[PDB]
Amino acid sequence: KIEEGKLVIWINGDKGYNGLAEVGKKFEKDTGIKVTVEHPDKLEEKFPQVAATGDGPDIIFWAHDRFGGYAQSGLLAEITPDKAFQDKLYPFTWDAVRYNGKLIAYPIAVEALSLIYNKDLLPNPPKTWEEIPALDKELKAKGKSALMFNLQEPYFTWPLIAADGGYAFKYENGKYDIKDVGVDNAGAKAGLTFLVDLIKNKHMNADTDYSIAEAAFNKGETAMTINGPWAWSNIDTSKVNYGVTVLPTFKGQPSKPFVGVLSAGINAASPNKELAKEFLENYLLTDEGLEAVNKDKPLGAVALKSYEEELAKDPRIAATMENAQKGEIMPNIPQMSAFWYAVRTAVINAASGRQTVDAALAAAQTNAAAMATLEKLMKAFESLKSFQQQQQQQHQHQHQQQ
Amino acid sequence: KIEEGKLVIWINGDKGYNGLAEVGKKFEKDTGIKVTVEHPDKLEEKFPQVAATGDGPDIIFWAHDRFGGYAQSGLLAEITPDKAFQDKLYPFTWDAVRYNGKLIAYPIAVEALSLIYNKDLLPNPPKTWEEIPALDKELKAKGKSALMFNLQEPYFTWPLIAADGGYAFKYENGKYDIKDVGVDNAGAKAGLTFLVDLIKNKHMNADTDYSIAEAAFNKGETAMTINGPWAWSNIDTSKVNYGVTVLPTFKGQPSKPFVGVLSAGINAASPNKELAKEFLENYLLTDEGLEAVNKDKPLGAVALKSYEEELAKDPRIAATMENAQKGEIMPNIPQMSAFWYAVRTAVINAASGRQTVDAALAAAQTNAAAMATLEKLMKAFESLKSFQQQQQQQHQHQHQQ
Amino acid sequence: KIEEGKLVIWINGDKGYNGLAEVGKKFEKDTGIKVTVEHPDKLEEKFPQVAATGDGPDIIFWAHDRFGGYAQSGLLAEITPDKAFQDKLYPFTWDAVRYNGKLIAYPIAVEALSLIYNKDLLPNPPKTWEEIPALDKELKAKGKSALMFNLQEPYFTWPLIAADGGYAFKYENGKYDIKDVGVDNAGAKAGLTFLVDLIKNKHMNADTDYSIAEAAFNKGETAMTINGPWAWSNIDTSKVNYGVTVLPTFKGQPSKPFVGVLSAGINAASPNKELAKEFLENYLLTDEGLEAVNKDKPLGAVALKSYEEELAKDPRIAATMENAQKGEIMPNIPQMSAFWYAVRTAVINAASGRQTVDAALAAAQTNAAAMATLEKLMKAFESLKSFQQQQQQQHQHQHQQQQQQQQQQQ
Ligand SMILES: [Zn+2]
Ligand SMILES: [Zn+2]
Ligand SMILES: [Zn+2]
Ligand SMILES: [Zn+2]
Ligand SMILES: [Zn+2]
Ligand SMILES: [Zn+2]
Ligand SMILES: [Zn+2]
Ligand SMILES: [Zn+2]
Ligand SMILES: [Zn+2]
Ligand SMILES: [Zn+2]
Ligand SMILES: [Zn+2]
Ligand SMILES: [Zn+2]
Ligand SMILES: [Zn+2]
Ligand SMILES: [Zn+2]
Ligand SMILES: [Zn+2]
Ligand SMILES: [Zn+2]
Ligand SMILES: [Zn+2]
Ligand SMILES: [Zn+2]
Ligand SMILES: [Zn+2]
Ligand SMILES: [Zn+2]
Ligand SMILES: [Zn+2]
Ligand SMILES: [Zn+2]
Ligand SMILES: [Zn+2]
Ligand SMILES: [Zn+2]
Ligand SMILES: [Zn+2]
Ligand SMILES: [Zn+2]
Ligand SMILES: [Zn+2]
Ligand SMILES: [Zn+2]
Ligand SMILES: [Zn+2]
Ligand SMILES: [Zn+2]
Ligand SMILES: [Zn+2]
Secondary structure, three states: OOOOOOEEEEEOOOOOHHHHHHHHHHHHHHHOOOEEEEOOOOHHHHHHHHHHOOOOOOEEEEEHHHHHHHHHOOOEOOOOOOHHHHOOEOOOHHHOOEEOOEEOEEEEEEEOOEEEEEOOOOOOOOOEOOOHHHHHHHHHOOOOEEEOOOOOOHHHHHHHHOOOOOEOOEEEOOEEEOOOOEOOOHHHHHHHHHHHHHHHOOOOOOOOOHHHHHHHHHHOOEEEEEEOHHHHHHHHHOOOOEEEEOOOEEOOEOOOOEEEEEEEEEEOOOOOHHHHHHHHHHHHOOHHHHHHHHHHOOOOEEOEHHHHHHHOOOHHHHHHHHHHHOOEEOOOOOOHHHHHHHHHHHHHHHHOOOOOHHHHHHHHHHHHHHHHHHHHHHHHHHHHHHHHHHHHHOOOOOOOOO | OOOOOOEEEEEOOOOOHHHHHHHHHHHHHHHOOOEEEEOOOOHHHHHHHHHHHOOOOOEEEEEHHHHHHHHHHOOEOOOOOOHHHHOOEOHHHHHHHEEOOEEOEEEEEEEOOEEEEEOOOOOOOOOEHHHHHHHHHHHHOOOOEEEOOOOOOHHHHHHHHOOOOOEEEEEEOOEEEEEEEEOOOHHHHHHHHHHHHHHHOOOOOOOOOHHHHHHHHHOOOEEEEEEOHHHHHHHHHOOOOEEEEOOOEEOOEOOOOEEEEEEEEEEOOOOOHHHHHHHHHHHHOOHHHHHHHHHHOOOOEEOEHHHHHHHOOOHHHHHHHHHHHHOEEOOOOOHHHHHHHHHHHHHHHHHHOOOOHHHHHHHHHHHHHHHHHHHHHHHHHHHHHHHHHHHHHHHOOOOOO | OOOOOOEEEEOOOOOOHHHHHHHHHHHHHHHOOOEEEEOOOOHHHHHHHHHOOOOOOOEEEEEHHHHHHHHHOOOEOOOOOOHHHHOOEOOOHHHOOEEOOEEOEEEEEEEOOEEEEEOOOOOOOOOEOOOHHHHHHHHHOOOOEEEOOOOOOHHHHHHHHHOOOOEOOEEEOOEEEOOOOEOOOHHHHHHHHHHHHHHHOOOOOOOOOHHHHHHHHHHOOEEEEEEOHHHHHHHHHOOOOEEEEOOOEEOOEOOOOEEEEEEEEEEOOOOOHHHHHHHHHHHHOOHHHHHHHHHHOOOOEEOEHHHHHHHOOOHHHHHHHHHHHHOEEOOOOOOHHHHHHHHHHHHHHHHHOOOOHHHHHHHHHHHHHHHHHHHHHHHHHHHHHHHHHHHHHHHHHOOOHHHHHHHOOO
């Protein structure tokens, strides 16, 4: 039961839902069909539960990486935009909303890491990673540092690692090959070796986490930091004069940060598929549609070419998109769990000097496969719980038989 | 040993063993070689144990789906019938007795699901699934229901599911591809959606089992049911005027029921491999041979073209074969274990409404891998135990080092 | 830290380390670079532990089968010999030091099983397996047996099993295909059948192990035994007049023993990679180089063609190489643990009569998969433990960097 004759939308609380409701208000005045916008707690946890039974919203807004799991479960419907509508959004975004060859969601916003520099300390940010060590010595004389960013999470260190030919899984033929991992290749080796060399030459500290990195830049202690659009608001409050720009190149190659895409998916159980399509394609994914949402709570860089060109007058939003286009799209597959587990360990152990770069990255392959087994066990036993509960109910009972 | 100079045959207690003994008695009169026919308890469980050590029968008669496990273990011999003898049996039946490319048994009988209708209530049975919802309303005016069949086991519901393009595993070039599963495709999806649509529209009950469906047809409460030849004798006692016909077509395409094939395999440890070929090919697999078995206990439809055409004068035996030819053969691979587990839950959850058809069939892949892991865990520890004794017991201990 | 400017070598205690040190001394006299040769206890277990952290020796010497694991962990560097140097060694040996398509070590010495016969009892050794049952009946009349070897280990029985077309894994394009297992094909079946046929015809005993086999040949109770070079010293002491020859052919096909290659690998963490290449290629892998090592403790057959020709004037060393050249190199992959586990059981069960050849060899496929399961099972929990305790490592390090990060500046 989702109610035929109306649309119900689920979007997270930190987004411009009131602005989205104004698009749904515009939709009513034209079609006479009422659009409700709901923003429930942990909707990402709730959606798989309710949609499995045939309930939940008509449309759901979330990051694309979580949509891979929804489509695996058959909770999302295959969308049908034509060639001409597909030309409206940046071609690279459409690859993020693909599962099993077929398209499963509409890309809305684009999210990726950028290089954030202090304008007062550093008017000309470096274009290369290689010139940062020399730039640190020049700033250490003034009692400052060149660069401080989170080293604990692989998400932040990956841009450098992937610069030279490092990848999570090979994306070819619209499918991720899980037998083709680019974690201990030549380019990932050099990327991490540069990061470790930065640490043992005291240009960075191996223990630097998110808090330590943010607090440093916002006090004016460090000239540069690596962070996403979610951090801009806190830098605005610190009164620091900052700029957001393209990430530094390593061995002439651009940094490849992970790209997160906010996407709109249609519930497979929805009896209003065509209505949702009309809403999303012809009301929301238009200049006026995205503007209403952006004015409530900024979307950052958007998928729609026409509206992105208008936001890109903000040099920070242009930088987000530029880094995104040069970046790697976040894979939406289940194997991504084992990847994080292994690479998080790999970088920690190389940065501490516990393992060589060569041996820490080699260990990732065997460490991720090990984690896949725990997940493989996890699913097997929860299946048995269900099986026993299944029979326990019908077949032999305190008041039944077979 | 299995004794050279004679044949010993294993065949289940519910088959025409006396009739087979007669065929052995004909064999003894022509060749001077004594044939013994035995029927031990749980011979399907006993065969893998004794054949592994080199003992057991020369020939074993059983459903082909169990012969995969025997051939995998190397307990069966590669049979050598020539082209001329292979034209004597229906072409599709040979696919049932093929493991790893090699042929490993002789096809004897053919079992499959068929549509059984009540002639007095419904003289003209529906040819399409699509017209059953309309046919139910017409019968509900007389307090009766159109169709009731077992919905708990997938074996019964699969015919519909596979109708439009669903399949267990892909079968090309004589071998299954365990990576080409067709339980999540558009055809299997539409098939199961029709089954669920029937239940949500009150034409069928989601909790109808084998007992409930059989009893309803034999009392005359329902007009149609889906079942195999095994159930005919119970309908015969109920005095119900019944017929057996082709399964209804869904989306203009036939239902594809799974096909069981009673097969005769030769033991790998048998010193009488040549005598078994002579007996199975030139004595049993003839009109006269199968006649003798069929008169003791009916074989149903048979693999041999000549004797089948003779049996097809019984319209029930013609329909069993017709449904079998349109259907697919029950895969004899070990991945079938996990396949059943996943599809049984898929259908139950779709029928009860715990999962949408799409979501129910999607979870099938993840449940098949679950049963695989679970099933592979138990092969791991079984092995560890065996080793443990072997090293533990044979290799050294008090009285040794 | 491994020290740049000098070479440190790890070689097992039962090898000619003094002879190697003399090659190190020769290197020092020409180049002025000192070479230390260390022989630590259980170095094969220690090397992965220390080379992971960036320590350990510059060069390591060990059987090639263990090097695959070192390469998998990225502890070994890619060696760079040119075409002209690769012609110096036997082409087959280079396949033993290969992993992921890269070369990872220099082949030094070759080790393989051979047929060892008693000369006084049997001057003309049988060229075929098929004539051994007939030759046993002749010797039983004189109160002796024809052949006695270890039947408990698959390493010893495999030569016969592999002969007609049995293989652990298919080696093509320089890669090991783990999906193509030839343990229950027609050839391996026929081999094991002959072995089992020998036992139930009382020509061999199913309970015969390494100790029973060796002691029986050394006292002069059996005419032939199958064993490696490692056992020659014991037979020398027993005053038995013995020869080492090519293994008997089964169905006209040669017996295929597994080949062990003693190899020199360069540490990936070594700051002397170019120095180690100079040493190994131009000082050790020369007639004079291997001469010095061989005179300390014999190497057996060697990888270097030139020095092999000189050693082949020993009829025992020539036979070791002959058997090694007809046999297959032991796969350097992890899947080999499960293979030994399964084949060991297969043969034990077939020999005892517990299972038929067919049933035994078919059950090897499931027994190998079961062992593979156990291994990744114990690897997954080692992974969980390591991570689980890593959560603490962070907690403690949150109270360390917090201060120091302020001490220096603050
Ligand atoms: Zn709020
Ligand atoms: Zn809320
Ligand atoms: Zn939330
Ligand atoms: Zn520096
Ligand atoms: Zn404009
Ligand atoms: Zn008997
Ligand atoms: Zn079956
Ligand atoms: Zn013929
Ligand atoms: Zn053949
Ligand atoms: Zn209806
Ligand atoms: Zn169609
Ligand atoms: Zn075909
Ligand atoms: Zn075909
Ligand atoms: Zn296919
Ligand atoms: Zn006839
Ligand atoms: Zn006759
Ligand atoms: Zn007749
Ligand atoms: Zn067909
Ligand atoms: Zn160190
Ligand atoms: Zn000199
Ligand atoms: Zn010199
Ligand atoms: Zn020592
Ligand atoms: Zn070895
Ligand atoms: Zn080659
Ligand atoms: Zn004999
Ligand atoms: Zn012993
Ligand atoms: Zn020299
Ligand atoms: Zn010389
Ligand atoms: Zn060869
Ligand atoms: Zn804490
Ligand atoms: Zn610390």
